[PDB]
Amino acid sequence: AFELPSLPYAIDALEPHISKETLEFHHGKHHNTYVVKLNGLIPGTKFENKSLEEIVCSSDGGVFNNAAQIWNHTFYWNSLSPNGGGAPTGAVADAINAKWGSFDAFKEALNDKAVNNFGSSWTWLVKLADGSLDIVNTSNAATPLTDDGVTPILTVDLWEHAYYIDYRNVRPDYLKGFWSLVNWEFANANFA
Amino acid sequence: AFELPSLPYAIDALEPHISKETLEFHHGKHHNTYVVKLNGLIPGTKFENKSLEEIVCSSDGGVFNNAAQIWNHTFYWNSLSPNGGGAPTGAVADAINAKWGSFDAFKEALNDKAVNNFGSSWTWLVKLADGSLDIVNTSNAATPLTDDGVTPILTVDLWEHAYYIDYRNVRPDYLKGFWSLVNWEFANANFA
Numbered sequence: 166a167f168e169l170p171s172l173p174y175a176i177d178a179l180e181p182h183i184s185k186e187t188l189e190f191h192h193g194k195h196h197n198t199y200v201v202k203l204n205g206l207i208p209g210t211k212f213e214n215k216s217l218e219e220i221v222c223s224s225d226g227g228v229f230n231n232a233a234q235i236w237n238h239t240f241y242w243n244s245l246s247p248n249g250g251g252a253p254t255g256a257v258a259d260a261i262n263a264k265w266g267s268f269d270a271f272k273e274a275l276n277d278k279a280v281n282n283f284g285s286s287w288t289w290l291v292k293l294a295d296g297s298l299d300i301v302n303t304s305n306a307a308t309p310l311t312d313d314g315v316t317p318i319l320t321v322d323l324w325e326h327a328y329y330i331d332y333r334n335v336r337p338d339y340l341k342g343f344w345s346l347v348n349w350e351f352a353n354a355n356f357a
Numbered sequence: 358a359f360e361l362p363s364l365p366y367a368i369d370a371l372e373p374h375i376s377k378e379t380l381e382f383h384h385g386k387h388h389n390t391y392v393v394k395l396n397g398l399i400p401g402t403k404f405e406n407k408s409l410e411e412i413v414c415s416s417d418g419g420v421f422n423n424a425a426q427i428w429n430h431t432f433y434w435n436s437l438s439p440n441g442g443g444a445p446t447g448a449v450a451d452a453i454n455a456k457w458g459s460f461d462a463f464k465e466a467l468n469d470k471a472v473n474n475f476g477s478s479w480t481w482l483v484k485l486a487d488g489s490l491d492i493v494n495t496s497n498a499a500t501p502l503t504d505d506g507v508t509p510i511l512t513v514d515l516w517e518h519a520y521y522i523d524y525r526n527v528r529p530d531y532l533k534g535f536w537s538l539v540n541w542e543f544a545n546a547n548f549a
């Protein structure tokens with residue numbers, strides 16, 4: 166049975182960009198529910214003994230939405246940090262300059278993809294087969310984890326539960342907290 | 358240019374099922390924003406002089422997302438009332454029993470469709486071409502308004518902004534609020 170991974174930092178730790186209550190609900194309840202639902206769905210199926218990733222990569226319907234949502238949320242928590250934010254560093258900063266010319270252009274491109282990602286969705290920083298970076302949008306539980314040859318680097322959850330408690334309807338304000346939390350170490354580990 | 362319709366009731370008329378705060382953000386900001394976006398999109402285009410329903414029935418991409426959304430939300434405020442709730446009456450009560458055997462079986466079927474309607478979505482009570490009632494789920498901005506032979510009767514908004522402020526992650530509590538508010542008078546009008 167799959168389990169809810171612990172949060173990589175205190176429920177307190179992303180303040181004032183993402184609040185304790187958001188983490189309590191977003192991780193403690195939303196994330197957990199996909200874990201629970203998934204565990205309920207696997208018995209009696211060909212997903213009985215496969216790893217999370219194996220299932221997300223081979224399922225559809227209910228098993229997929231729940232499995233992918235677990236993986237996506239786990240990847241999202243890793244994409245934030247009480248010690249992140251600010252300028253990118255390392256391999257990632259250079260690839261960002263290589264693709265977009267500057268960090269600022271990359272940031273304006275991701276903000277634009279993110280605010281316009283209609284409905285419950287996710288905006289991703291991914292590394293392509295050709296080694297280059299790109300920004301791709303997925304809807305609901307969809308994830309580049311299943312795009313062959315594409316490597317997920319960072320993600321921002323845009324389902325409303327992710328920011329409604331702290332930002333109501335204003336995604337840019339949310340995106341602001343995201344940029345003050347971005348976990349460049351996790352980005353660089355995925356990139357390398 | 359299109360306009361934000363007024364709410365059919367006072368801002369606190371739906372308390373304690375839907376809070377004045379939710380009404381302020383949902384109707385005053387989200388609903389509004391769809392109107393503003395569509396006004397910002399149709400100038401100079403073919404849609405410029407069409408009615409809202411003509412636009413929804415003839416567009417895609419962003420024009421459709423905003424048009425359908427203004428339409429869906431206006432239908433939704435109408436689907437709630439400070440004087441609704443409790444048992445269905447009239448024509449709709451009888452068609453409900455014709456389809457589901459009883460009002461109680463109908464509630465369980467709608468609740469079920471709505472709690473499992475994944476991501477930003479809407480759950481509708483509809484009248485089909487054979488004259489019978491059914492419940493259908495649409496995603497994001499999609500609406501049965503565009504389905505041939507299908508007439509919208511009532512809708513419950515399941516995008517998280519519709520209930521997060523009041524019910525956080527617990528959709529069944531929000532659906533109990535909906536049942537205390539359902540406008541049978543609007544439903545019987547749509548039906549006849």
Ligand SMILES: OC[C@H]1O[C@H](O[C@H]2O[C@H](CO)[C@@H](O)[C@H](O)[C@H]2O)[C@H](O)[C@@H](O)[C@@H]1O
Pocket residue numbers: 225226227228230305473474475476478494495496
């Ligand atoms: O796990 C239950 C099902 O979830 C999805 O379907 C639900 O959500 C859809 C919108 O995302 C609705 O259109 C649909 O009516 C709901 O049943 C998934 O597509 C299904 O395969 C799952 O069984």
Ligand SMILES: OC[C@H]1O[C@H](O[C@H]2O[C@H](CO)[C@@H](O)[C@H](O)[C@H]2O)[C@H](O)[C@@H](O)[C@@H]1O
Pocket residue numbers: 281282283284286302303304417418419420422497
């Ligand atoms: O009007 C802008 C576009 O809105 C939609 O696309 C955005 O939201 C999608 C998810 O609903 C994302 O996948 C997409 O990347 C975003 O641009 C709509 O589907 C497009 O047709 C519109 O042009």
Ligand SMILES: [Fe+2]
Pocket residue numbers: 191195238322324326327
């Ligand atoms: Fe989430």
Ligand SMILES: [Fe+2]
Pocket residue numbers: 383387430514516518519
């Ligand atoms: Fe809404």
